[PDB]
Amino acid sequence: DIKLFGKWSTDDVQINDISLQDYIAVKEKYAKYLPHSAGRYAAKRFRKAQCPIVERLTNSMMMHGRNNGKKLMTVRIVKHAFEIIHLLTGENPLQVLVNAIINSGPREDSTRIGRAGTVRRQAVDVSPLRRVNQAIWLLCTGAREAAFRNIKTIAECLADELINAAKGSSNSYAIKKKDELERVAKSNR
Amino acid sequence: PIKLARVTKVLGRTGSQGQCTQVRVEFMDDTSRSIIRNVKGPVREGDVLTLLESEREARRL
Amino acid sequence: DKLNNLVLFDKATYDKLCKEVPNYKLITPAVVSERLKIRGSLARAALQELLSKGLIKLVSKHRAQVIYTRNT
Amino acid sequence: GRVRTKTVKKAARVIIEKYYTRLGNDFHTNKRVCEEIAIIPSKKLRNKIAGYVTHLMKRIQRGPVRG
Amino acid sequence: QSVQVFGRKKTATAVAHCKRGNGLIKVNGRPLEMIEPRTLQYKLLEPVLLLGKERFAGVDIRVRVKGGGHVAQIYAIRQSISKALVAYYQKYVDEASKKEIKDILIQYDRTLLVADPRRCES
Amino acid sequence: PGVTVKDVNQQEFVRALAAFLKKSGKLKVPEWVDTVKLAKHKELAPYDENWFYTRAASTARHLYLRGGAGVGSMTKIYGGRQRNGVMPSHFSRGSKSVARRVLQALEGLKMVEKDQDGGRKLTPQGQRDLDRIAGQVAAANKKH
RNA sequence: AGACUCUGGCAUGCUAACUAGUUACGCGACCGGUCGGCGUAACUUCUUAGAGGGACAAGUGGCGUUCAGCCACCCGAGAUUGAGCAAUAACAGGUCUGUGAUGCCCUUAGAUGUCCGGGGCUGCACGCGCGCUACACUGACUGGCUCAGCGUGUCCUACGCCGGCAGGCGCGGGUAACCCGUUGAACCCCAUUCGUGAUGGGGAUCGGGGAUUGCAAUUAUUCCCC
């Protein structure tokens, strides 16, 4: 049976949301040994839904300027992060990650409708894939921002971020961002 | 109250820059209540949404 | 304000290291460096000492991130 | 997109008009017979001609053409 | 009695040499566990971990590697292992088994048999 | 008893070789060791007090793995990134003297052979020694 | 324009390769295995360079005046490769050592006379701009590990010795799929030290030496070390 990093279970992972049950891919067939797979996912549209969620996370963690190519680094970060999570909660880290993703992604968004000049945006519904992508982006950004100028490691910081977003507490950056977007989207209508 | 949704049909592209997708929403509450909504991001036929307000109806006529 | 960390131990520090530290669930040189106002070097050294004594379990040793566990 | 060439068309018409009996619906067979009938320099061109013939015969065996 | 295939990723070409042996997989004179990027070690061990050591029982594989970077090389190597095994099954064993193995491998990762068509564009 | 050098964790093997070199006692050590750099490209002196041994071991290993190497070749191996300041970085070869004195030292210990071919390869005795060290490391890995 | 041609993707089919490589077999070295150690029976998988194939909207489904065509999909290496040709339109932009006993203007006012020596092109309050290095912890340093390709070369350089270091000194190969050169690359990976501070990040600016290049380095040629 396939285990992530050769230690992490995937059959225990339970998706709470019915909306994201299709787009977070980790459960059975999509489960892989390593995050690094280096297959084309930007080949055609919606294909990055069929890409593993850990892999996606990895790919958004190397995003920044000086780190722009280094994928092995990213995967090491992810691994250590997972270990940290395990140490902390005792729960399966993949499950935690999934939870975080669920609780980080925005549900509604204010978007410019009319012309350039009319600054009254209309609050619109958010795609499930986009909600996943955006969530991932937010989490990675949080990880970055917590780990810039301190003794804290990115693996540690990322783990912290992910647990905070898993629990639903207002200590995560991602959660805060969601709250800020969501309230705005409740204001515009 | 939070209501879940379906996608019956993807109609076209609304919005200023062509960012919003106009989509036919069937409810997952068993009712055949077909409300047309606007979504941000990529939506294909067979997606399931999480609408914050269900009472709302997007730009019809 | 600036951060002032102890480069070498104090009695209060030493006691809070031999008693309190081997019961943190997650023990990280960075976390120990943040909890008790210690420089990362000294904290690392302490961790190593604790490993050598046999009070604290080891998870993974790396060039960057070394992770430790409380015993039972 | 993609559109048929005049030359390809005319040659195809010639080939059908003269030697309908030899040709069929198998593309490859039609190609090969074409190669053995007409003076063709290019391979690509020949292939195109064959394709046109094949399409034409798919169409023609249902009902007669205008051309 | 012996098979010689290639796997190509990017520039990196790995030639695998499959023969009736005792179950040895050596890449450029060293074991699969003894290759430097041990963060990407699992990727190289995938054809072994998927099909089991039971299918790799009496087969000796020597992998000759050349070109590319590190990751690319790894990818080539793994490919050529899988392809090598498949070819051996085709040639000197039955077809059904080959079909099965191939099915398994495609069902896990598509890259493992068919090569990535893209390489460094001008 | 059948193990080989290539089938062993490389770093660990190197370490063990270095240790062996140390515990033997006999090796020609230059007097500038606590003063020298190791390349024009590097910034500081090496951290290790007994770095010379280590480097010798490494050289030996390289000779074993790939023969017909000279001093130039050895310099090309141990080269790296020159931090050219505000100018962009380039590749620069190692310290010729250091390599030269490693090779002379190992050759003195009857571990390295000067060649008809051109450069330098390995002695049979040296090879034997290497394989003994590989065995040692192997035993201390499969049983550990 | 398209068409024509090339090119690239594909071949465990074919043609070959003493300047390509593999396999097997001998001998040797090492612990029944490892060897870019060496010596000819296997012929092309890798490498090369050729011929012949191979994709034509071929097939299926949908849409279409039921045609021209368009969209989707299976198999496939490839279903929409890139270039040149292809030798347009307007030019009142023209171009060139072609001919006119060509029209003028100039020729101690040489339509830049040749040479000689030394300077300048870098000069610096400032604007407007392309870049390089950075602003560190996903880091820096230190040691160890392992992988290219486009290319070049009668100055590219192998190898020994003297050198802390740039470099010297000796001796060879290459007018080149042969030697540099299994191009031994860097990132990266693996361990070591540092610990959020103008910090060992960052290196500007400067002060002393030394070494080349060259007729000449003073306004630092460039490199090296503090």
Swiss-Prot record, chain A:
Keywords noted in UniProt: Acetylation, Cytoplasm, Isopeptide bond, Nucleus, Phosphoprotein, Ribonucleoprotein, Ribosomal protein, Ubl conjugation
Positions where N6-acetyllysine occurs in the chain: 32
Major place of residence: cytoplasm
Gene Ontology process terms (BP): cytoplasmic translation; regulation of translational fidelity; ribosomal small subunit assembly; ribosomal small subunit biogenesis; translation; translational initiation
Crosslink position(s): Glycyl lysine isopeptide (Lys-Gly) (interchain with G-Cter in SUMO2): 32
InterPro entries on file: Ribosomal_uS7, Ribosomal_uS7_CS, Ribosomal_uS7_dom, Ribosomal_uS7_dom_sf, Ribosomal_uS7_euk/arc
Signal peptide: none
UniProt xrefs under CDD domains: uS7_Eukaryote
A Pfam family matched in the record: Ribosomal_S7
MF annotations from Gene Ontology: mRNA binding; RNA binding; rRNA binding; structural constituent of ribosome
Keyword set includes Phosphoprotein: yes
Summary of the function given for this chain in its UniProt record: Component of the small ribosomal subunit. The ribosome is a large ribonucleoprotein complex responsible for the synthesis of proteins in the cell. Part of the small subunit (SSU) processome, first precursor of the small eukaryotic ribosomal subunit. During the assembly of the SSU processome in the nucleolus, many ribosome biogenesis factors, an RNA chaperone and ribosomal proteins associate with the nascent pre-rRNA and work in concert to generate RNA folding, modifications, rearrangements and cleavage as well as targeted degradation of pre-ribosomal RNA by the RNA exosome.
Database matches in PANTHER family: RIBOSOMAL PROTEIN S7 (PTHR11205)
Protein name, UniProt field: Small ribosomal subunit protein uS7
Recorded name of the encoding gene: RPS5
UniProtKB/Swiss-Prot annotation, chain C:
Keyword terms of this UniProt record: Acetylation, Cytoplasm, Ribonucleoprotein, Ribosomal protein
Gene Ontology terms describing biological process: cytoplasmic translation; ribosomal small subunit biogenesis; rRNA processing; translation
GO molecular function term, any single one: structural constituent of ribosome
Compartment(s) where it occurs, according to its Swiss-Prot or TrEMBL record: Cytoplasm
Modified residues (N6-acetyllysine): 2, 11, 19, 25, 53
One GO cellular component, as annotated: cytosolic ribosome
Residue positions, PTM N6-succinyllysine: 11, 53
Major subcellular site: cytoplasm
Entry's family note: Belongs to the eukaryotic ribosomal protein eS25 family.
Binding partners and assembly: Component of the small ribosomal subunit.
Function: Component of the small ribosomal subunit. The ribosome is a large ribonucleoprotein complex responsible for the synthesis of proteins in the cell.
Record protein name field: Small ribosomal subunit protein eS25
Taxonomic classification: Eukaryota, Metazoa, Chordata, Craniata, Vertebrata
Residues of the whole record sequence present: 42 to 113 of 125
From Swiss-Prot, chain E:
UniProt subunit comment: Component of the small ribosomal subunit. Part of the small subunit (SSU) processome, composed of more than 70 proteins and the RNA chaperone small nucleolar RNA (snoRNA) U3.
Source species, domain of life: Eukaryota
Gene: RPS16
GO biological process: cellular response to leukemia inhibitory factor; cytoplasmic translation; maturation of SSU-rRNA from tricistronic rRNA transcript (SSU-rRNA, 5.8S rRNA, LSU-rRNA); ribosomal small subunit biogenesis; rRNA processing; translation
Protein name: Small ribosomal subunit protein uS9
Gene Ontology CC: cytoplasm; cytosol; cytosolic ribosome; cytosolic small ribosomal subunit; extracellular exosome; focal adhesion; membrane; nucleolus
Keywords: Acetylation, Cytoplasm, Nucleus, Phosphoprotein, Ribonucleoprotein, Ribosomal protein
GO MF term list: RNA binding; structural constituent of ribosome
Subcellular location(s) of the protein: Cytoplasm; Nucleus, Nucleolus
Entry's family note: Belongs to the universal ribosomal protein uS9 family.
Modified residue annotations for N6-acetyllysine: 53
Shown part of the complete sequence: 8 to 129 of 146
Swiss-Prot record, chain F:
Gene Ontology molecular function terms on file: fibroblast growth factor binding; identical protein binding; protein kinase binding; RNA binding; structural constituent of ribosome
Impact reported for residue 56 to P: In DBA1; affects protein stability; does not localize to the nucleolus; affects assembly into a functional ribosomal subunit
Primary location group: cytoplasm
Membrane spanning stretches: none
Outcome of mutating residue 61 to W: In DBA1; increased protein degradation; affects assembly into a functional ribosomal subunit
Cellular-component GO terms for this entry: cytoplasm; cytosol; cytosolic ribosome; cytosolic small ribosomal subunit; extracellular exosome; focal adhesion; membrane; nucleolus
Subcellular location field: Cytoplasm; Nucleus, Nucleolus
Effect on the protein of changing residue 55 to Q: In DBA1; affects assembly into a functional ribosomal subunit
Chain positions with N6-acetyllysine modification: 22, 110, 114
Mutagenesis or variant effect for residue 51 to R: In DBA1; affects assembly into a functional ribosomal subunit
GO BP term, example: nucleolus organization
Result, substituting residue 100 to H: In DBA1; increased protein degradation; affects assembly into a functional ribosomal subunit
SMART domains to which the protein is assigned, alphabetical: Ribosomal_S19e (SM01413)
Protein keywords: Acetylation, Cytoplasm, Diamond-Blackfan anemia, Disease variant, Host-virus interaction, Methylation, Nucleus, Ribonucleoprotein, Ribosomal protein
Family to which this protein belongs: Belongs to the eukaryotic ribosomal protein eS19 family.
Family matches, as PANTHER family: 40S RIBOSOMAL PROTEIN S19
Name of this protein: Small ribosomal subunit protein eS19
Source organism per UniProt: Homo sapiens
